[PDB]
C-alpha cells in the first residue's frame, strides 16, 4: 500500500519569484491535507526552477563498455577533491521536444555518438525538499569505438569499471549513480535483447 | 578522439573570483563567478553559475535483514507538484547536517524521531551529488539495521518488502533521488549484507 494523497488534496495559494536571473528562485505558498484528517496550516517552501532534462547513459552492448563525458561543475567544489566529474550524456528539455530527441542530440553533440536503439531507464526527482528539476534517463545502443570529443573530455571506459568507480566514489553524481547501478542490474538481459 | 581507460585536474586548477549572494533566506543562492583550465591548455573565460546552497543531507535506508524488509516514509514535497502524479513521495529517512554532526547521528536521530526506529548496525552505501549543475548539495546515504517490527511534519510509515520497494522503483513510483539509488544498491548487496547481519 502506498501513498494516499493525490493533487486534490493540495492547495497552492501563491508562488512567489524570490529571484529571477538564468534560474528563479520561487516560494511556493501552499495547504495539504493531513494523514490524521484536516487540513495544514499555510506553508512555504523555497523551490529552485531550472527546468528539466534528459539524460543518456550510452551503452555499447557488443563491447561491454559504458561512453562518460568529464567536464567542470562548479557547485561540485565544496564537498569534493575535484569538481570536474564523470557524467552522462544529458541536456536541458526545452518546451515541445521529447526526452529521446534531447538524448539523442546530447549524444551525438557531447560525445560524437549516433545512438540506435534506446530504452527507459527511470526517471527521477534530484531533490525534492529544494528544487522541482526532474531527470528522465534512457540507455542508448552505441559503438563505444566511435566516441569523439563548454570543455568537455569522452571517456570510454567498461560497464565493469565504470561501476566499481561508482562504488569507489570516482563516480558520484546522480544521473551517473543511477544509470550504472540500473545498468550494473539489467546489462544481461539488455546484452541479449541487442545482440539478438 | 576519446580516452579509453586501457590506454587531471585539481582544485589548483580553478580560480574562484567571487561567490556573490543573490539571494538569502531559508536557504541560499549564490554566484559563483570563475575561471577554470581548459584539457587543451589554458584558462577558461569568465563563468558565471547560479548555485542554490542548501547545505548536505545524510540518508537512512532503514533494512531488516531478518525478515527482507525496509521502511519507507511518506509526506509531501511540494517541489514535486508540476511533474508528478502527486507531491506525497515514498522516501527514505533523512536529515540536514549541521556543523559539527556526523552524517551517522543525523541518520540517527531522524530514524528515531521520524519512524520510532533504534537503529543497530550500519554500512556507508554511497554520497552523491543530487544535481551538481544547479546545488552544492551532497547527500550521504548509510543503510542501517532495524527492527521493521518496531516502527510507528506530517509523515506516515510504511513497511514493504524489500521486493515490493524494489518492484515500486521499476514502476515509478519511488523516484526520489535518494530512495532509487538506496534501494538499487540494495538489490545489489542484499544477499550478502543479510549473511552479515544474521551471521
Known sequence: QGITFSKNDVEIIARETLYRGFFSLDLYRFRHRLFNGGMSGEITREIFERGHAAVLLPFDPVRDEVVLVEQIRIAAYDTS???????????????????????????????????????????????????????????????????????????????????????????????????????????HNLRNEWTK
Open 81 to 187: 577533491e575535484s569538481p570536474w566529474l564523470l557524467e552522462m550524456v544529458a541536456g536541458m528539455i526545452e518546451a515541445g521536444e521529447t526526452v529521446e530527441d534531447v538524448a539523442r542530440r546530447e549524444a551525438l553533440e557531447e560525445a560524437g555518438l549516433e545512438v540506435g536503439r534506446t530504452k527507459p531507464i527511470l526517471s527521477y526527482l534530484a531533490s525534492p525538499g529544494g528544487t522541482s528539476e526532474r531527470l528522465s534517463i534512457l540507455v542508448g545502443e552505441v559503438d563505444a569505438s566511435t566516441a569523439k570529443g563548454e570543455d568537455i573530455r569522452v571517456h570510454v571506459v567498461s560497464r565493469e569499471q565504470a561501476y566499481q568507480w561508482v562504488e569507489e566514489g570516482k563516480i558520484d553524481n546522480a544521473a551517473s549513480v543511477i544509470a550504472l547501478q540500473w545498468l550494473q542490474l539489467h546489462y
